[PDB]
Design an enzyme around this catalytic site. Structure first.
Site, PDB file in Angstrom:
ATOM      1  N   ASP A   1       7.785 -14.348   3.206  1.00 30.18           N
ATOM      2  CA  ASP A   1       6.765 -13.531   2.681  1.00 30.18           C
ATOM      3  C   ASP A   1       5.891 -13.755   1.741  1.00 30.18           C
ATOM      4  O   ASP A   1       6.229 -13.973   0.519  1.00 30.18           O
ATOM      5  CB  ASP A   1       7.769 -11.979   1.884  1.00 30.18           C
ATOM      6  CG  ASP A   1       6.842 -11.141   1.702  1.00 30.18           C
ATOM      7  OD1 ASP A   1       5.723 -11.027   2.361  1.00 30.18           O
ATOM      8  OD2 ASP A   1       7.385 -10.017   0.921  1.00 30.18           O
TER       9      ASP A   1
ATOM     10  N   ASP B   1      -0.421 -11.480   3.948  1.00 28.46           N
ATOM     11  CA  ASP B   1       0.968 -10.875   3.872  1.00 28.46           C
ATOM     12  C   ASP B   1       1.653 -11.042   5.121  1.00 28.46           C
ATOM     13  O   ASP B   1       1.846 -10.218   5.959  1.00 28.46           O
ATOM     14  CB  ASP B   1       0.731  -9.497   3.320  1.00 28.46           C
ATOM     15  CG  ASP B   1       2.269  -8.710   2.971  1.00 28.46           C
ATOM     16  OD1 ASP B   1       3.000  -9.329   2.986  1.00 28.46           O
ATOM     17  OD2 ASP B   1       2.312  -7.659   2.696  1.00 28.46           O
TER      18      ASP B   1
HETATM   19  N1  LIG Z   1       1.690  -2.350   2.102  1.00 31.35           N
HETATM   20  C1  LIG Z   1       2.770  -2.322   2.657  1.00 31.35           C
HETATM   21  C2  LIG Z   1       3.862  -2.654   3.341  1.00 31.35           C
HETATM   22  C3  LIG Z   1       4.126  -2.288   4.606  1.00 31.35           C
HETATM   23  C4  LIG Z   1       5.344  -2.534   5.297  1.00 31.35           C
HETATM   24  C5  LIG Z   1       6.313  -3.028   4.653  1.00 31.35           C
HETATM   25  N2  LIG Z   1       6.107  -3.521   3.243  1.00 31.35           N
HETATM   26  C6  LIG Z   1       5.015  -3.330   2.634  1.00 31.35           C
HETATM   27  N3  LIG Z   1       4.934  -3.896   1.406  1.00 31.35           N
HETATM   28  C7  LIG Z   1       6.319  -4.204   0.711  1.00 31.35           C
HETATM   29  C8  LIG Z   1       6.131  -4.468  -0.808  1.00 31.35           C
HETATM   30  C9  LIG Z   1       5.190  -5.580  -0.872  1.00 31.35           C
HETATM   31  O1  LIG Z   1       5.632  -6.820  -0.525  1.00 31.35           O
HETATM   32  C10 LIG Z   1       4.684  -7.370   0.625  1.00 31.35           C
HETATM   33  N4  LIG Z   1       5.046  -8.459   1.399  1.00 31.35           N
HETATM   34  N5  LIG Z   1       3.857  -6.556   0.763  1.00 31.35           N
HETATM   35  C11 LIG Z   1       3.667  -5.321  -0.151  1.00 31.35           C
HETATM   36  C12 LIG Z   1       2.575  -5.582  -1.332  1.00 31.35           C
HETATM   37  C13 LIG Z   1       1.651  -6.498  -1.150  1.00 31.35           C
HETATM   38  C14 LIG Z   1       0.598  -6.495  -1.787  1.00 31.35           C
HETATM   39  C15 LIG Z   1       0.747  -5.769  -3.061  1.00 31.35           C
HETATM   40  F1  LIG Z   1      -0.422  -5.625  -3.864  1.00 31.35           F
HETATM   41  C16 LIG Z   1       1.675  -4.638  -3.193  1.00 31.35           C
HETATM   42  C17 LIG Z   1       2.631  -4.690  -2.414  1.00 31.35           C
HETATM   43  F2  LIG Z   1       3.625  -3.861  -2.568  1.00 31.35           F
HETATM   44  C18 LIG Z   1       3.907  -4.088   0.579  1.00 31.35           C
END
Ligand SMILES: N#Cc1cccnc1N1CC[C@H]2OC(N)=N[C@@]2(c2ccc(F)cc2F)C1
EC number: 3.4.23.46
Length: 374
Positions: free
Chosen positions: A223, A34
């Site tokens: 991303d 990620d």
């Molecule tokens: N955790 C965290 C995190 C920490 C800091 C910033 N953003 C995060 N996100 C953003 C929303 C998604 O977008 C991305 N790139 N990862 C996320 C994700 C990944 C997998 C999954 F199943 C579900 C998800 F919501 C989690």
């Protein structure tokens, strides 16, 4: 980097994961790659959708940091407990890192039924780590503790059950067999997300003619943990209008453009030529230059008769260049030189008439003014 080729797997729409081991003796876990987050976090207690999880008590090298962490986002949240342990990537570099690990003890709408991964590897920078920037991210630890050069690259290939997809995460270098043609670089604007700047967008060679601030409102990021190309509301609306027009020879339900409904064609008859190409122009290393990455409908219509979901969606948190843009390309996250490189991927999509491309330079005026002033 031959032992690292084909070290990623996943199900369409559910992310790409790499096998890792945690602890001593090593516990094998599949971990989502990620580039949109910065925590190394692993399921550490039972859950309906987890077929295995990290058991700290089984590890002789676990150290408890006696600190909790809460990570709400939307559409969900996870919480857990911080610690360190030894971590390795079997089909990665031949090293072992003592890394921070968030052991996830409770979660809502995070783990995904059937996705085959049990944790996430946040490859972005400390600025967006939880609980704050003092929790060193995995890649930072890897570079500090081992000799590995400060760069990695991702070749995502993608395209009953959801289709299996594959790809490669090359840690510490650039594998020239994974791409063709030239590598073009865009600057990382700020080291938090992998933030970049889009200066122009064309749909079938027609400029959307927006002020380029609109394309980066409030930011644009690359991303691997988001499936879709997500666009800010005004840009999304302009784009779908244009895609609708090019494809108007047919008509699809509103839910298809909302990326909710599938559209199906008799197997093999998928009419690719009615959908336009989309070019994103990224700011070059030279201030008034840009280069374009051109993606095909084979990337932005995601297989789910042959059935597809439209994988371009509306964002309220800026542009997200997700998996469906990256699958076009070999993408170099050159942290050492604060830049992200793109080249046409050895696994790009193309048909007899069209192909993904990376082309430049295009000369473009005032693109420093395409960003958002923090
Ligand atoms: N955790 C965290 C995190 C920490 C800091 C910033 N953003 C995060 N996100 C953003 C929303 C998604 O977008 C991305 N790139 N990862 C996320 C994700 C990944 C997998 C999954 F199943 C579900 C998800 F919501 C989690």
């Amino acid at each position: 980097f031959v032992e690292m080729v084909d070290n990623l797997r996943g199900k369409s729409g559910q992310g790409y994961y790499v096998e890792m081991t945690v602890g001593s003796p090593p516990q094998t876990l599949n971990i989502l790659v990620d580039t949109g987050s910065s925590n190394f976090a692993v399921g550490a207690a039972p859950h309906p959708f987890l077929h295995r999880y990290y058991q700290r008590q089984l590890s002789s090298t676990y150290r408890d940091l006696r600190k909790g962490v809460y990570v709400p986002y939307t559409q969900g949240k996870w919480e857990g407990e911080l610690g360190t342990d030894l971590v390795s990537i079997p089909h990665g570099p031949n090293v072992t890192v003592r890394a921070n690990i968030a052991a996830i003890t409770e979660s809502d709408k995070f783990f995904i039924n059937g996705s085959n991964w049990e944790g996430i590897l946040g490859l972005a920078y400390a600025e967006i780590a939880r609980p704050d920037d003092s929790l060193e991210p995995f890649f930072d630890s890897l570079v500090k503790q081992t000799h590995v050069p400060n760069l990695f690259s991702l070749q995502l290939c993608g395209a009953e059950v959801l289709a299996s997809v594959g790809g490669s995460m090359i840690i510490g270098g650039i594998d020239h067999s994974l791409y063709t043609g030239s590598l073009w670089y865009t600057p990382i604007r700020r080291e938090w997300y992998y933030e970049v700047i889009i200066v122009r967008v064309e749909i079938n060679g027609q400029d959307l003619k927006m002020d380029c601030k609109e394309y980066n409102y409030d930011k644009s990021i690359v991303d691997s943990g988001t499936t879709n190309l997500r666009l800010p509301k005004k840009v999304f609306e302009a784009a779908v209008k244009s895609i609708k027009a090019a494809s108007s020879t047919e008509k699809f339900p509103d839910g298809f453009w909302l990326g909710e409904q599938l559209v199906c064609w008799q197997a093999g008859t998928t009419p690719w030529n009615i959908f336009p190409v989309i070019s994103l122009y990224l700011m070059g290393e030279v201030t008034n230059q840009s280069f374009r990455i051109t993606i095909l409908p084979q990337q932005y219509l995601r297989p789910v008769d042959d059935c597809y979901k439209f994988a371009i969606s509306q964002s309220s948190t800026g542009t997200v260049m997700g998996a469906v843009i990256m699958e076009g390309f070999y993408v170099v996250f050159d942290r050492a030189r604060k830049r992200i490189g793109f080249a046409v991927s050895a696994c790009h999509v193309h048909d007899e008439f069209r192909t993904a491309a990376v082309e430049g330079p295009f000369v473009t005026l005032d693109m420093e003014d395409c960003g958002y002033n923090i």
